[PDB]
Design a protein around this motif. Structure first.
Motif, PDB file in Angstrom:
ATOM      1  N   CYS A 109     -11.415  -1.945  -8.822  1.00 22.37           N
ATOM      2  CA  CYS A 109     -12.296  -2.704  -9.965  1.00 22.37           C
ATOM      3  C   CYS A 109     -14.045  -3.353  -9.076  1.00 22.37           C
ATOM      4  O   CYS A 109     -14.082  -3.742  -7.983  1.00 22.37           O
ATOM      5  CB  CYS A 109     -11.865  -4.533  -9.874  1.00 22.37           C
ATOM      6  SG  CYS A 109     -12.098  -5.273 -11.393  1.00 22.37           S
ATOM      7  N   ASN A 111     -15.858  -5.814  -9.883  1.00 21.76           N
ATOM      8  CA  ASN A 111     -15.641  -7.175  -9.970  1.00 21.76           C
ATOM      9  C   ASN A 111     -15.462  -7.752  -9.189  1.00 21.76           C
ATOM     10  O   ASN A 111     -14.120  -7.743  -8.295  1.00 21.76           O
ATOM     11  CB  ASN A 111     -14.166  -8.136 -11.396  1.00 21.76           C
ATOM     12  CG  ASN A 111     -14.940  -9.812 -10.836  1.00 21.76           C
ATOM     13  OD1 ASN A 111     -16.331  -9.784 -11.169  1.00 21.76           O
ATOM     14  ND2 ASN A 111     -13.804  -9.968 -12.536  1.00 21.76           N
ATOM     15  N   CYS A 114     -12.361 -10.696  -9.236  1.00 19.57           N
ATOM     16  CA  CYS A 114     -11.876 -10.447  -9.252  1.00 19.57           C
ATOM     17  C   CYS A 114     -10.014 -10.486  -8.675  1.00 19.57           C
ATOM     18  O   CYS A 114     -10.717 -10.549  -7.311  1.00 19.57           O
ATOM     19  CB  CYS A 114     -11.202  -8.704 -10.076  1.00 19.57           C
ATOM     20  SG  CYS A 114      -9.473  -7.890 -10.093  1.00 19.57           S
ATOM     21  N   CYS A 138      -9.337  -3.639 -16.669  1.00 18.71           N
ATOM     22  CA  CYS A 138      -8.685  -4.058 -15.893  1.00 18.71           C
ATOM     23  C   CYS A 138      -8.165  -4.918 -15.739  1.00 18.71           C
ATOM     24  O   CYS A 138      -7.891  -5.883 -16.929  1.00 18.71           O
ATOM     25  CB  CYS A 138      -9.823  -4.963 -14.285  1.00 18.71           C
ATOM     26  SG  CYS A 138      -8.798  -5.596 -12.985  1.00 18.71           S
ATOM     27  N   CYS A 141      -8.612  -9.378 -14.187  1.00 13.85           N
ATOM     28  CA  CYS A 141     -10.138  -9.638 -14.825  1.00 13.85           C
ATOM     29  C   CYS A 141     -10.639  -9.704 -15.944  1.00 13.85           C
ATOM     30  O   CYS A 141     -10.912  -9.876 -16.672  1.00 13.85           O
ATOM     31  CB  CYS A 141     -11.432  -9.494 -13.999  1.00 13.85           C
ATOM     32  SG  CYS A 141     -12.086  -8.078 -14.284  1.00 13.85           S
TER      33      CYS A 141
HETATM   34 ZN   LIG Z   1     -10.656  -7.098 -11.609  1.00 17.72          ZN
END
Ligand SMILES: [Zn+2]
Ligand SMILES: [Zn+2]
Lengths: 153, 310, 153, 310, 310, 310
Positions: A109, A111, A114, A138, A141
């Motif tokens: 990911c 992020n 996350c 995802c 997240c």
């Molecule tokens: Zn994520």
């Protein structure tokens, strides 16, 4: 469909033969999908002489067969790869990677907040096409990212 | 059973319009006829890894109002686990061996969704998972829009302020996008504009909306006026001041607003709603806050109760 | 040289041939010393039938030759490996790996307070042998570990 | 009355094998047939001067599951007393004028024992007094050994890891030393070896035990595998790494373990049990955690209840 | 009487194109022929009320490289004057009865200008006043730019990153506007772009400036590459990783680049600049820092001395 | 070209027995005939990223005792470079464009060696890199040892305390192994003893070394007494007070001691050394500290100057 005949070749009696892998994707695959975490005979040819690529990647796995999902799993990377099943020194059926629905265990990911990052979890992404790039959302997240971005070094 | 029995409430997107109506309906009923010994003997975990004593207090209040017992914490830098050693999985895993349901607030996005993989059968309710989701807030919100408007369909809904960094507005819009005929007004400062994807789902679903610079521009048509905080921290304290004067609501600004027009606000406000608005009928943020209690009572009842007998 | 089972196979033009790699080490080495990064036909024989040595791995990089030192790099993963320089289909000559002095940027310092972790520095350990155990010492934190402890990665 | 009525549970040493059996028995019964209005009207103080939200939450959960009301705190650097002014005596003295029993966690050893001198008649339960004692943990432990093994006698019990700085292992061993035929395996790193005195009580009581370097060495004979955390902080972060690889349990390590073999762990784990062990039957640390609830229910019931009527 | 003897250095706009060229000339003289007894017997105050690494160390080093003496502080978090109750005014009012010149970094905008009013005769130099000014950075930017190209005129200068918040990036822009034939490539995210006022002066100045999506979009057209660091906390961790990919520099982006071309960064750099750029000729950020010495020496020199004999 | 001109001082093992004798000779020359304009115009950076009292002050004093100029920092807890996001590398990469030499203390093992790689030409000196090295301590240990006995050879040297964790204690051991006829008494708790590797080199070196239970066990046999401070937090408060009694020094332990015999300690001392030892001839820890001046002066001298005329 690759015929080298000065230093000949062998097409295994049974198992799967993944063709036309783009070059340098070849390692990426088996590292990503632990195809070498098996004791069965494997034959790998790197940067081969291809007609369309010149330099292509070719995995040969013996006495081994892959679910369509497995094959579909490869669409992201080798969208032109060619899975060939093989029994009794013969081509029991061609196969083709089709863009899955979801992509578990291999993805990472973008992020950085996350929770999949600090915990022991399987990355999962829903796959949607957007006539320019595939989008990956995802599991956790719920953030959506360009495949271009998710596959970032 | 009820559609939501024993299910985890994680994101607002996982819920159907029926699922919404069902909760909203229930909420109205528990608001109407209270069932104070309904969740008696049940013990609920109120795990706020992230402090938020507005959400918390609500939930817990809810919990007691149905007769459940409550255990939990607030900020787990005080807690013994999770600063370097305990994973969240191992924590949920232990917790879900002795409570009947888990309510959890967490700094990382996807934290509530991960919980579900280790709670086994114990239901998990998201009370906020980083910038991701806060379903109950939206539930609270809708149930107040409905109870004051009379519908969730064919509304004139204006969202105002930090539309870029407002999870609750993105959810509301999505939720409200589940219903039809709704019309949207986005009155935000360009650095803080309604994100594209949201805008595309609208265009995609066929929902009408338009950007505006002035509330005044669109006051006379709005039924619901949803206000957000414009966290100055989100920008230049000088570039803030320059814009702030355009997205601040004074009593006077409402003089042409419909009878049914209700001003909404997730709280805490601070600068965007002048206190002279409180003194007016359109002010419904406190009421909207109290409605948080039935929204949550509603939820708790349905997840934990096979048959909602009302 | 060549592999076959009644049917030919390849002996590359020129280049080296690593052989007698133990089972499930050939990959490591491929990923480890990153020998896959060239654009010249590589050939990899996974889980081949060693029979005598059991079933070892095998690599054949063509048009690429191996330095006396990178051969010693494999001293710790494939000590029984056999590296053959190959020209005109035949064996100009071959060596075995011998123990290196220092193992560079492949290993990792078990010491978690070693500065080496955070920083853009490439690791380096100093290889020493005692009994049957090998001892790598961190160039930075200067802490000595058994080769079994640093060999997690 | 019951043997434990109105008694203070301070150290595991003060308890008899009968006292143990009695609690273990009760635990099985409350686990079996729940008495949710048993301690109703009773108010219990949950005083955690030391944060530990695993122990706490357990206890409190227990408390509600018997219908008691709960008041208390967590870390008393937030509390108003005890940073420079209030003594613990004066604090217990006031507290024990308005609750029915006190559960307390405290940073200094002997803190629970001191409480008893000022609580008057109100019972005091030790939930941890510095490195000294943590009786309930052991109770939790035994009751899980028993419930899974079927006995507390003639077992093959292996304790692993930081045997030097593990109060819970020293207690378990002592407790287990109350029963007969037990055989011990101590698999620890030399800097963190089973303390002499413990070793002498064994030699003294006639209990068999032996040191080992490898789990593998002794897997096939162990019924219970008690794991401990090897707090790296307890040593050189480089000297840690060197040993750690010998006292870490991977799924694979269990392949020759008995059917009845159960892997135990006080929690929180971190590095010593690989998550692939969770996926196996031998993994019983979460279950062991949940059993903490009856162990504590058991205790609460007996101390506060003259006649346990089950 | 040099044009800057006894003059204050608060904002770059306070400096003429000549004043600039003046400083730089000096700066290059001093780089050649060190005069380390030049500011002997002068005592300089280094008052960092905000953290600094380069600015505080480079300055004090400059101070010793010319024989001066340093007194001052760093992290006046609160202590005794400034943040804790004493007014900056009063602070200065007394520190200027102590030293010959004052150097100060301060978190408030315009603190340095204020100082001006209470230092009486003693000059103040601006080391960073909040988000406002940073002349001595910009001076060491210009020198370096000229040291490596030979002109401050008629250049292809590309700025990247946080063109919205990065003071050094606007400053740099302002100064280069004082020279002619200079053209700008602004390569930043739209949520982080060059404020319009800048854009306006360039146009009220006649200066040409485009706007590029990415760095390797303009690569071959530029002499100087100016990387400002992008702040993630000012961005969503999702968002921050959304544009990110096309605002990071790596040696592979450099192939199409001219050889005249140098990459500078005010530092510190996080990851905007890859370490493989570190080993590339265009890499000129560490050098740029070295030159902060001479830029700052010259200035100190010029402000405190009638004129030099260099 | 002195053997250490422009050389880095990271680890003691990097120094030959000659390099040692070299430094000490210098050190004693300088002690006699001060040269306080020797390092004039050199500017030294004192970068303490970890706390130091003796090392940071003794060094800077050494720095001024030779005319040098100092810049640097202490407690870089996080600020701007190092702990907070900038890499040490980059830190150094810029500080070495500033000064002539770098002195640094750092909590990570091998930070100083890393520095080496980014200082380019500028030498770094190790002031403590985590639990790894501390040469300049050990240099001032050796000088003192020789200043008071006349030889670094054929000595009865007893080390006490934390022989397991105390860097200075291993360092000291390493260096004295470079001279001949030296024999060691290691008087430490078994839970805190001299690592085997040390023990091995001494044996792979042929050096004699016993192991004594207590200090007054060897008392009459020793020339130098080396007290390392024992850490209680690394020990149980019970345990720490278990062996404690026989690893504390008091004037009454000193009677049987030779008159040649001196007690040194790297300091700070807690209570390992009683204050009555303070008034006894063997007491030589404060002196040892004074000599840190000369040891550190010599070094600075030697590294930065071609060679002296002393
Ligand atoms: Zn994520
Ligand atoms: Zn290391």
């Amino acid at each position: 469909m690759t015929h080298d005949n000065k230093l000949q070749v062998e097409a295994i009696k049974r198992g799967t033969v993944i063709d036309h892998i783009p070059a340098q994707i070849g390692f990426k695959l088996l590292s990503l999908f632990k195809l070498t975490e098996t004791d069965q005979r494997i034959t790998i040819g790197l940067n081969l002489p291809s007609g369309e690529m010149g330099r292509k990647d070719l995995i040969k796995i013996e006495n081994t067969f892959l679910s369509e999902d497995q094959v579909d799993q490869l669409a992201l990377y080798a969208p032109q790869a060619t899975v060939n099943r093989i029994d009794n020194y013969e081509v029991v059926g061609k196969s083709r990677p089709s863009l899955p629905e979801r992509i578990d265990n291999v993805l990472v990911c973008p992020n950085s907040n996350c929770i999949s990052h600090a915990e022991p979890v399987s990355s999962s992404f829903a796959v949607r096409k957007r006539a320019n790039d595939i989008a990956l959302k995802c599991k956790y997240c719920e953030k959506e990212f360009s495949h271009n971005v998710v596959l970032a070094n | 059973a009820n559609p939501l029995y024993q299910k985890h409430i994680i994101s607002i997107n996982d819920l159907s319009r029926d699922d919404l109506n069902l909760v909203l309906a229930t909420a109205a009923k528990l608001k109407a006829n209270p069932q104070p010994e309904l969740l008696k003997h049940k013990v609920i975990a109120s795990c706020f890894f992230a402090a938020s004593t507005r959400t918390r207090l609500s939930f817990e209040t809810s919990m007691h109002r149905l007769g459940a017992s409550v255990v939990g914490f607030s900020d787990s830098a005080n807690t013994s686990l999770g600063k370097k050693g305990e994973t969240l999985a191992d924590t949920i895993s232990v917790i879900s061996t002795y409570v009947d349901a888990i309510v959890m607030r967490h700094p990382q996005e996807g934290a509530a969704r991960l919980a579900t993989e280790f709670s086994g059968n114990v239901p998990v309710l998201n009370a906020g998972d980083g910038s991701n989701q806060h379903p109950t807030q939206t539930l609270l919100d809708l149930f107040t829009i409905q109870e004051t408007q009379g519908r969730l369909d064919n509304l004139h809904v204006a969202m105002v302020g930090d539309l870029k960094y407002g999870r609750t507005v993105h959810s509301l819009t999505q939720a409200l996008a589940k219903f039809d005929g709704n019309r949207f007004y986005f009155i935000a400062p360009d650095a803080l504009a309604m994100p594209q994807y949201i805008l595309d789902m609208l265009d995609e679903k066929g929902i009408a909306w338009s950007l505006h610079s002035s509330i005044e521009e669109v006051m006379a048509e709005v039924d619901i006026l949803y206000m957000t905080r414009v966290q100055k921290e989100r920008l230049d304290p000088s570039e803030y001041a320059n814009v702030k004067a355009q997205f601040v609501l004074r009593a006077s600004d409402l003089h042409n607003a419909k009878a049914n027009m209700k001003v909404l606000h997730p709280l805490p406000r601070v600068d965007e709603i002048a206190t002279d608005v409180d003194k007016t009928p359109h002010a419904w943020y406190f009421q909207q806050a109290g409605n948080g209690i039935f929204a949550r009572q509603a939820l708790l009842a349905l997840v934990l109760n096979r048959d909602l007998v009302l």
